[PDB]
Design a binder for this molecule. Structure first.
Ligand SMILES: *[C@@H]1O[C@H](CO)[C@@H](O)[C@H](O)[C@H]1NC(C)=O
Ligand SMILES: *[C@@H]1O[C@H](CO)[C@@H](O)[C@H](O)[C@H]1NC(C)=O
Ligand SMILES: *[C@@H]1O[C@H](CO)[C@@H](O)[C@H](O)[C@H]1NC(C)=O
Ligand SMILES: *[C@@H]1O[C@H](CO)[C@@H](O)[C@H](O)[C@H]1NC(C)=O
Ligand SMILES: *[C@@H]1O[C@H](CO)[C@@H](O)[C@H](O)[C@H]1NC(C)=O
Lengths: 118, 118, 118, 118, 118
C-alpha cells in the first residue's frame, strides 16, 4: 500500500492593512477679550495662464503616468485670518499591482507514477 | 490499496483592510467677549485662462494616466475669516490591479498514473 | 481499492474591507458676547476662460484616463466668514481591476488514469 | 472498488464590504448675544466661457475616460456668512471590473479514466 | 508500504502593516487680552505662466513616471494671520509592485516515481 499526496498550493495574496487615525485635539479658549479693528482689507490675487501647443507622452506607451504636462496647482495659499486646517488634505494612493503589467501564473502540478508491480 | 490526492489550490486573493477615522476634536469657547470692526472688506481675485492647440498622449497607449495636460486647480486659497476645515479633503485611491494588464491564470493540475499491476 | 481525489479550487476573490468614519466633534460656545460692524463688504471675483482647438488622447487608446485636458476646478476658494467645512469633500475611488484588461482564467484539471489490472 | 472525485470549483467572487459613517457632531451655543451691522453687502461674480472647436479622444478607443476636455467646475467657492457644510460632497466610485475588458473563464474539468480490468 | 508527500507551497504575499496617528495636541488660552489694530492690509500676489511646445517622455516608454514637465505647485505660501495647519498635508504612496512589471510564477511540482516491485 502506497499513498501519493501533493497538496500544491499556489497562493498570490498581497495585501496592505492600515489603522489610520486623525484627532483634531482639544482647543480651549476661556475668558478671551478682544478688540479687532481692520479697516480696508483689500487683498489682490491675479493668476494668468497661457499655453500654446502643449504635449505629453508623444511617443511610445508610458506604463503609469501620474506626472503632468505644464499645469498649475493652488492650495491654501492666502488664508488671511483665523484659518484652521485640521487633517485638511490627505492623499493616499495604495497600489498592489501597477499599470502595464503581465501576470502569467501557471500552477499545473504533475503526478503520473509509472508503477508496475508484478 | 493506494490513494492519490492532489488538493491543488490556485488562489489569487489580494485585499486591503483599512480602519479609517477622523475626529474633529473638542472646541470649547467660554465667556468670549469681542468687538470686531471691519469696514470696506473688498477682496479681488482675477483668474484668466487661455489655451491654444493643447494635447495629451498623442502617441501610443498610456496604461494608466492620472496626470493631466495644462490644467488649473484652485482649492481653499483665500479664506478670509473664521474658516474651519476639518478632514476637509480626503482623496483615497486604492487599486488592486492597474490598467492595461493581462492576467493569464492557468491552474490545470494533471494526475494520470500509468499503473499496471499483474 | 484505490481513491483518486483532485479537489481543484481555482479561486479569484480580491476584496477591500473598510471601516470609514467621520465625527464632527463637539463645538461648545457659552456666553459669547459680540459686536460686529462690517459695512461695505464688496468682494469681486472674475473668472475668464477661452479655448481654441483643444485635444486629448488624439492617438492610440489610453487604458484608463482620469487626467484631463485644459480644465479649471474651483473649490472652497473664497469663504468670507464663519464658514465651516467638516468632512466636506471625500473622494474615494476603489478599483479592483482597471480598464483595458484581459483576464483569461483556465481551470481545467485533468485526471485520466490509464489503469490496467490483470 | 475505486472512487474518482473531482469537486472542481471555479469561483470568481470579488467584493468590497464597507461600513461608512458620517456624524455631524454636537454643536452647542448658549447665551449668545450678538449685534451684527452689515450694510451694503454687494458681492460680484462674473464667469465667462468661450470655446472653439474643442475635441476629446479623436483617435482610437479609450477604455475608461473620466477625464474631461476643457470644462469648468465651481463648488462652494464664495460662501459669505454662517455657511456650514457637513459631509457635504461625498463622491464614491467603486468598480470591480473596468471598461474595455474581455473575460474568458473556461472551467472544463476532464476525467476520462481508461480503465481495463480483466 | 511507502508514502510520498510533497506539500509544495508557492506563496507570494508581500504586505505592509501601518499604525498611523495624528494628534493635534492640547491648545489652551486663558485670560487673553488683546488690542489689534491693522488698517490697510493689502497683500499683492501675481502669478504668470507662459509655455510653448512643452513635452515629456517623447521617446520610449517610462515604467513609472511621477515626475512632471514644467509645472508649478503653490501650497500654504502666504498665510497672514492666525493660520494653523495641523497634519495638513499627508501624502502616502505605498506600492507593492510598480509599473511595467512582468511576473511569471510557475509552481509546477513534479513527482512521478518509476517504481517496479516484483
Ligand atoms: C489596528 O489594527 C489591528 C488589526 O490590524 C486591530 O487589532 C486594532 O484594533 C487596530 N487599532 C487601531 C487603533 O486602529
Ligand atoms: C480595526 O479593524 C479590525 C479588523 O481589521 C477590527 O477588529 C477593529 O475593531 C477595527 N478598529 C477600528 C478602531 O476601526
Ligand atoms: C471594523 O470592521 C470590522 C470587520 O471588518 C468589524 O468587526 C468592526 O466592528 C468594524 N468597526 C468599526 C468601528 O467600523
Ligand atoms: C461593520 O461591518 C461589519 C461587517 O462587515 C458589521 O459586523 C459591523 O456591525 C459594522 N459596523 C459598523 C459600525 O458599521
Ligand atoms: C498597532 O498595530 C498592531 C498590529 O499591527 C496592533 O496590535 C496595535 O493595536 C496597533 N496600535 C496602534 C496604536 O495603532
Amino acid at each position: 500500500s502506497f499513498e501519493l499526496t501533493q497538496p500544491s498550493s499556489v497562493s498570490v495574496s498581497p495585501g496592505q492593512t492600515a489603522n489610520i487615525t486623525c484627532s483634531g485635539g482639544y482647543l480651549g479658549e476661556t475668558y478671551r477679550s478682544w478688540y479687532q479693528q481692520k479697516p480696508g482689507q483689500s487683498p489682490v490675487l491675479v493668476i494668468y495662464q497661457s499655453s500654446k501647443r502643449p504635449s505629453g507622452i508623444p511617443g511610445r506607451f508610458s506604463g503609469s503616468n501620474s506626472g503632468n504636462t505644464a499645469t498649475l496647482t493652488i492650495s491654501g495659499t492666502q488664508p488671511l485670518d483665523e484659518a484652521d486646517y485640521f487633517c485638511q488634505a490627505w492623499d493616499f494612493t495604495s497600489v498592489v499591482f501597477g499599470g502595464g503589467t503581465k501576470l502569467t501564473v501557471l500552477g499545473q502540478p504533475k503526478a503520473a507514477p509509472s508503477v508496475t508491480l508484478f
